Design a binder for this molecule. Sequence first.
Ligand code: HEM
Ligand code: HEM
Lengths: 145, 145
Amino acid sequence: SVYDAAAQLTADVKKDLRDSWKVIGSDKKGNGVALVTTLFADNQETIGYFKRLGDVSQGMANDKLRGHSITLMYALQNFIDQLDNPDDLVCVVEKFAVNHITRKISAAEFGKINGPIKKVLASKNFGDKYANAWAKLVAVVQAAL
Amino acid sequence: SVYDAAAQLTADVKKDLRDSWKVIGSDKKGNGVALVTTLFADNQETIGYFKRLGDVSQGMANDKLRGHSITLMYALQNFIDQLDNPDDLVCVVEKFAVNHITRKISAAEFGKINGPIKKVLASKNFGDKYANAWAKLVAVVQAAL
Ligand code: HEM
Ligand code: HEM
């Protein structure tokens, strides 16, 4: 249940999400491309789903990949801004869930983003505590897939 | 080209866009729903395109419509944040253009959003100068359709 999952975002979890987002969200282009390209590097088997972006190995030089990555960071911005109101967080999560359901992305494969998030966070000196907080946010989307 | 339309946005136009966005972008749920519902009210012929959202006459109560409307405001947030780097503005504009090209939305039809934008701006006392600035931003997307 997406609602029960949203209920797992306690005061402490919300605070860790906001504190870490202040840093990672400050460079959406740089950190977004880092996040997406790490997903491709660590899970080569997912590249097939991103056929529209062309040659993803080009990273930042690929305009479609850059546009996609920046936009992905605004989806995360959206989630963070809705943390105060569960009903609104749920309706935006379900909107993005549909974007992935139509692409045939399951909850398990969506969860493959946790590795990249942990790595990007670690590179900015945010440890497991923060990675786990972000895993709980990702879990809300998973509940909707 | 889209780059041309983007590169033409002047300092004065960007200033007007940012100043008005500070206000209308401060309540994404409220102003986003107002924007979308006004489109339906003034251009009833477009309702059919949004069948995935269900009964749009439900307004704010319709969770799918609310999720869609909030997300639309983040696309605008994205655009506003990329104003000073035409290269980044172009790649995000083309990303959203694809979302509309796939739904068979023509440049002319995309321009129907100008009426609703003008009304929402007016509700916050932003006059014609501001509506014209926003029409210039919308025209950047139209260059991609
Ligand atoms: C933090 C997690 C993620 C977020 C917030 C996210 C967000 C997004 C957004 C905003 C889009 C654009 C939707 C559209 O315009 O149609 C998108 C597209 C996509 N996402 Fe994700 N995504 C995430 C993780 C994943 C993962 C882990 C996979 C695959 C295992 C995945 C696969 C896709 C695919 C295939 C597309 C379509 C790309 C295209 O053809 O344009 N996403 N995602
Ligand atoms: C300020 C202008 C507009 C912006 C920034 C915008 C933004 C968006 C976004 C972010 C989406 C979601 C894309 C996806 O996840 O697939 C969307 C979907 C859509 N837009 Fe727009 N849009 C605008 C104007 C319009 C106009 C004027 C029309 C129609 C005449 C239109 C028709 C559609 C349709 C049919 C969908 C699909 C809805 C669904 O089934 O989920 N858009 N738009």
